[PDB]
């Protein structure tokens, strides 16, 4: 019992925290992709400029 | 994009409107030159100097 319960919460938090690395890793390639696509948005806006 | 292309839509309006004021002011200032080479091809033409 001691041995299940121990080994319960260690992949409790194991899980939560590897949850913020996936997450953290989606929020920084969210703001690389809004760069990306933003940046390709005006250079296409100066195409129809020109 | 649509920022843009509104933006060129009336440039090229009010473009065309500056095209069409050069265009009949040239319209008359070209014509004080209907004498002379019309004088020369008809000489060109003609084959003396006349």
């Known amino acids: 019992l001691a041995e299940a319960s121990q080994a319960h919460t260690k992949a409790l938090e194991d899980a939560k925290s590897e949850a913020h690395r996936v997450v953290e890793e989606a929020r920084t390639d969210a703001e690389r992709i809004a760069e990306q696509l933003e940046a390709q948005a005006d250079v296409e806006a100066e195409r129809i400029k020109m | ?50």
Request: glycine share 4%; aromatic share 0%; no cysteine.
């Open chain 2, 1 to 50: 994009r649509v920022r843009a292309e509104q933006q060129v839509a009336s440039t090229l309006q009010t473009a065309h409107e500056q095209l069409k004021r050069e265009r009949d002011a040239v319209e008359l200032d070209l014509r004080a030159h209907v004498g002379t080479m019309s004088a020369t091809l008809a000489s060109r033409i003609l084959g003396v100097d006349l």
